[PDB]
């Protein structure tokens, strides 16, 4: 207990104290400076923070795996996941040592508390479902809860209308690859545009027109680089260069026959995966067909979802497969590099959101905000239950944990009450970044719920207790259940360590 677990408690708390300033909407972002490559990254989420920081404590590395679970499932506000488990390790320093209770009994106290916590989350859930009129309008305020935890919150009201219309164009699409997020340097966050179509960072050819209406777009996986690659282990056996000069030149006409098969489709736009030689590029100009190249893998995949087309390798049949059509493909130059703006898609299969910012660190970090926000919108459509956040959910569970402690009684109540006290420290840490009084705000919130008012909550903007429904603080049941159930089981494994085995370094 003493030498067995020493750095497993204080060491894990010291890690959570570094990210303590990152918790909450009023928190601040931490700078990650790598000792190699002389690069840097500014991120609030602990997924990148805990991954790049050296961890001497093996228990701290376990907190990275549980962070990756909330990173994919939720991704926003994941700091409180490891912080909640750190408070359970602080209470375990007493009950196990001072009170002299076996660690498994303390774990069993948290096991019965985890079952009682799930009952408090389901009964307190609010059902928003059925008619999508008031539902979609509520998604504006529901998203603003987890939308911006950063210092970028000035873009909340601006991105609230863009994120709402993003799922509206998807029309029930749960795939996160159907949305396109564009990161552009310069400008302001309020300059973000949302149109129906796709905007590519590439350009057209030299003589390609700048505006084409009713263009038919078709992609493919072929390789136009030069000649024909054929099979492996080939060679040319000729008597002289008279036949050799014809073989190289004829294949340029053979590729033109494949381009002649492209002209049978009647497409006004062509897109190739790999690079294109100048001769087949000029043949596209004679036919009046745009050309796009230099797409490694996802280049042709992201455009296939927007246009709703299909990759055609053979070019044999102008009947089957798919033909995509866009109203206006005109090239529109945004910022410095010219961009290819598509509009008037055949269907709503996909959508594209354009973001603009002055700092490059804002583009990469805010990308995770809209990426996680759309996941929340997909969960509110699937899971019909929602809860209320803003420090209120922790005090509601504390009422159920303290109620179960009266039924169990015994010496396990010390571990059950410690779980409730650990839930009391989370809003204290949540309100610690705002710099307001903890004893004043927690006592007003904790006592109000015992009086039968579940609509109250912590307001860090005005520094008082306000209604979470009026301020628009709403969390879905899928987000709340995933955080509580994982954080309760995260510290369950950390409390099972009775020994430390350090292997010899390589």
């Amino acid at each position: 207990a003493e030498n067995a677990r020493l750095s497993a408690f204080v060491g894990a708390i010291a890690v959570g104290d570094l990210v303590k300033s990152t918790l909450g909407p009023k928190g601040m972002d931490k700078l990650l400076q790598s000792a190699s490559s002389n690069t840097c990254m500014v991120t609030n989420d602990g997924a990148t923070i805990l991954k790049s920081i050296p961890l001497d404590n093996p228990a701290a590395k376990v907190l990275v795996n549980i962070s990756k679970v909330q990173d994919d499932e939720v991704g926003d506000g994941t700091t409180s996941v490891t912080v909640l488990s750190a408070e359970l390790l602080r209470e375990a320093e007493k009950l196990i040592d001072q009170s002299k209770i076996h660690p498994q009994t303390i774990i069993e106290g948290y096991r019965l508390a985890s079952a009682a916590a799930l009952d408090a989350l389901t009964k307190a859930a609010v059902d928003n479902s059925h008619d999508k009129t008031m539902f979609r309008e509520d998604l504006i305020h529901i998203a603003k809860t987890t939308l911006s935890s950063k210092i970028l919150s000035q873009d909340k009201d601006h991105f609230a209308e863009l994120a709402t219309n993003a799922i509206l164009r998807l029309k029930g699409s749960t795939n996160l690859e159907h949305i396109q997020i564009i990161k552009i340097l310069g400008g302001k966050l309020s300059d973000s545009f949302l149109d129906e179509g796709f905007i590519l960072a590439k350009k057209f050819g030299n003589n390609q027109p700048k505006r084409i209406e009713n263009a038919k777009i078709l992609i493919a996986n072929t390789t136009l680089d030069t000649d024909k690659v054929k099979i492996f282990g080939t060679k040319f056996k000729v008597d002289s260069t008279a036949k050799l000069a014809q073989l190289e030149k004829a294949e340029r006409e053979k590729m033109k026959n494949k381009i002649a098969k492209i002209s049978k489709f009647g497409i006004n736009t062509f897109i190739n995966r790999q690079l294109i030689y100048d001769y087949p590029e000029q043949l596209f100009t004679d036919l009046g067909i745009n050309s796009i190249e230099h797409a490694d893998f996802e280049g042709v995949e992201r455009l296939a979802l927007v246009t709703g087309g299909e990759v055609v390798s053979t070019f044999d049949e102008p009947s089957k497969c798919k033909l995509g059509e866009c109203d206006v493909i005109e090239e529109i130059m945004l910022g410095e590099q010219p961009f290819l703006k598509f509009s008037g898609c055949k269907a709503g299969e996909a959508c594209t959101i354009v973001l603009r910012g002055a700092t490059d660190q804002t583009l990469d970090e805010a990308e995770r905000s809209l990426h996680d926000a759309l996941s929340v919108l997909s969960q509110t459509t699937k899971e019909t239950r929602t809860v209320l956040g803003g420090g209120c959910a922790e005090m509601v569970m504390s009422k159920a944990v303290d109620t179960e402690a009266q039924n169990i009684d015994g010496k396990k109540s010390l571990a059950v009450e410690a779980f409730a006290r650990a839930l009391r420290q989370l809003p204290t840490i949540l309100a610690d970044n705002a710099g307001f009084d903890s004893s004043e705000l927690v006592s007003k919130l904790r006592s109000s719920i015992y009086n039968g008012i579940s609509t109250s909550g912590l307001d860090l903007n005005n520094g008082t207790i306000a209604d979470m429904r009026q301020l628009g603080i709403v969390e879905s049941y899928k987000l709340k259940r995933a955080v509580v159930s994982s954080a309760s089981e995260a510290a369950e494994v950390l409390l099972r360590v009775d020994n430390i085995i350090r292997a010899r370094p390589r």
């Binding site: 000792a35 923070i49 920081i53 030299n206 060679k235 002289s240 008279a242 050799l244 001769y279």
Partner: protein, 480 residues
Amino acid sequence: KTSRGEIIISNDGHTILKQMAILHPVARMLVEVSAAQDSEAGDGTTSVVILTGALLGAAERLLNKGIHPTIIADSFQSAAKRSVDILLEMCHKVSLSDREQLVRAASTSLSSKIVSQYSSFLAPLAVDSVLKISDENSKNVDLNDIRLVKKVGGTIDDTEMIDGVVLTQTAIKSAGGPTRKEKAKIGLIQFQISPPKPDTENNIIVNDYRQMDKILKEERAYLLNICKKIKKAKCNVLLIQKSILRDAVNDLALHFLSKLNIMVVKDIEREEIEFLSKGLGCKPIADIELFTEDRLGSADLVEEIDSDGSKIVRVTGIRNNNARPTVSVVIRGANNMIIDETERSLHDALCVIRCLVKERGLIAGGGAPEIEISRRLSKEARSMEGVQAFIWQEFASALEVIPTTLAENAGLNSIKVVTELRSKHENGELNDGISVRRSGTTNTYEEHILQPVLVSTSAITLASECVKSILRIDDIAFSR
């Protein structure tokens, strides 16, 4: 001095911060500020770069007050939005197309380095460059249509903007038979002239000693037949792309073109072909099959200027007029150091008028906007009665740091200038600013001290964005 030994002498803030070695994690992000100033503004970098470290003195004074950084950052956000509206009230009405105004407004950015003595000839070249390439609808006006030619030798007084296609690289010069080209077609060759050499394995079975020289005769005939169709099209000027890649060229191509009096040039970048195709309008030729007379362009005369041993090709006249012409200017200087000084000097003048096309507003700078904004800010800050009253007032006190530095850097007393500024700008009208030549305050319109509103708006925006990123970092952690 870089790691490779490159010596660069300039006062440009973006150039200094580019090669500057910074061991401080947060200070490394200050290079991004100078990168955004070149993309957005791109003009008057020496005057704009001071905004990177100007707010550092104001942010340090607020740390002792115990105010949360978000409150300080959000106060600068509203103060920046109010500062933009102040600049829009004092702007001057300026027409889109004019002559003396474009020379007077750009002359502020034209004079920084000692090279401003020759800026008298640079103003007609900078105005006519935008006068030729522009749109009355206020488009983006990409600067890529104006190419800066770097040639060693001569003086800036010899710098002249060419009205037609210019070629920096010369020919092989081995044969050098033709001394001039006039009334001839100028083609664009995207391929290369070499004996066939496919990328795959090539095995030529030779069963007779006569077949060896026969292969040589086939290589001579196959490569000449391409020149026969070029001679049939009456094209004496050929442009080949970079020749060091794969095929390159043989030694027999010189005698074929010299007999036909056809000039050829190689080692041309692929990006240069796109630039030359816009102004010349000649359709590039990617193979002899697509080669024809309709794709070829034409020109009245092509003269090769030889000065101080450096030869340069100049094309006069354009046959087919397209909707996307291009212009270029040949920079003449003693050494690459002066050429680099003129390089950044011409980048400023192009960005001044470019911001005037997008936003026709113009405001007098040189100390005027710093005092006017600070006067309308601290006055309204006292009416806030809260945390915003003790921030915006301190932020307004940071706006006078720029004219304080301009006074000390000019040798004049700082307070003596500020006293003249604070007294005159109290009531205030316009045009009142610091004059370095007269050593005092006078009208900046006659002293050629100005600045676009879009530049001043983007300057205070990136300055407000800089303090946001600095305050955004609450802790310094060394990761792996």
